[PDB]
Design a protein around this ligand. Structure first.
Ligand SMILES: [Zn+2]
Ligand SMILES: [Zn+2]
Ligand SMILES: [Zn+2]
Length: 178
C-alpha cells in the first residue's frame, strides 16, 4: 500500500484499501472510511466494480439524461467519486470552506457554495437527482468567476472547473463530441 493519502498526498493516520494499493485519511475518503468492514474496498475499487458488472455503462450518454437520473445508490457513489476527484487537486483548497466577500468593486454571490457544503449535502442525502449535485458544483466556479471579475485569480475557478468537467464526462460516460 501507498504511504501517502491518495487525495491530499500527505502522510498521517491512513486507512489502506484491501483491493488496490491506495490509502486515505479518514475524512479525505468519500464517504468517510467505514468503522469496521474487513476487507475494505475504497471508492476507486467500488467504481471499477460497477463498470465491470455492466460494461455497456461505458457507452456514451447525453448530459441531459444523466442529470435527470435519480440519486439511487450507484449514482450517489458516482457523485461521491466525482467530488473526491475535485478534492484530489491541490487547487481545491480555495473552494473547500465557506468563502466571504469584501472586495472593492464587487458584490458577493446571492447563493454562496463550497466543496464542504456539497460534501455534507451528499452525506445527508439532500440531492434527489444528479442535476442537484452538478448544479451546486458548477455554481462554486461560476460564483468565483463573477466575483473576481478581471483579477487573474479568476483563473483558479477555470482550472478547478476543468478538472470537475473532465471527471464528470469520464465517470458518467458522456458521449464524446467535437
Ligand atoms: Zn488526505
Ligand atoms: Zn481500492
Ligand atoms: Zn449486464
Amino acid at each position: 500500500n501507498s504511504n501517502i493519502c491518495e487525495v491530499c498526498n500527505k502522510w498521517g493516520r491512513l486507512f489502506c484499501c484491501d483491493t488496490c494499493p491506495r490509502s486515505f485519511h479518514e475524512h479525505c475518503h468519500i464517504p468517510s472510511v467505514e468503522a469496521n468492514k474487513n476487507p475494505w474496498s475504497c471508492i476507486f475499487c467500488r467504481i471499477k466494480t460497477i463498470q465491470e458488472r455492466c460494461p455497456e455503462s461505458q457507452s456514451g450518454h447525453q448530459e441531459s439524461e444523466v442529470l435527470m437520473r435519480q440519486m439511487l445508490p450507484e449514482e450517489q457513489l458516482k457523485c461521491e467519486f466525482l467530488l473526491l476527484k475535485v478534492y484530489c487537486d491541490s487547487k481545491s483548497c480555495f473552494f473547500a470552506s465557506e468563502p466571504y466577500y469584501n472586495r472593492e468593486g464587487s458584490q458577493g454571490p446571492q447563493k454562496p457554495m463550497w466543496l464542504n457544503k456539497v460534501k455534507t449535502s451528499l452525506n445527508e442525502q439532500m440531492y434527489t437527482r444528479v442535476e442537484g449535485f452538478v448544479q451546486d458544483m458548477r455554481l462554486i466556479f461560476h460564483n468565483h468567476k463573477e466575483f473576481y471579475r478581471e483579477d487573474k485569480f479568476t483563473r483558479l475557478g477555470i482550472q478547478v472547473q476543468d478538472i470537475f468537467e473532465k471527471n464528470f464526462r469520464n465517470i458518467f460516460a458522456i458521449q464524446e463530441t467535437s
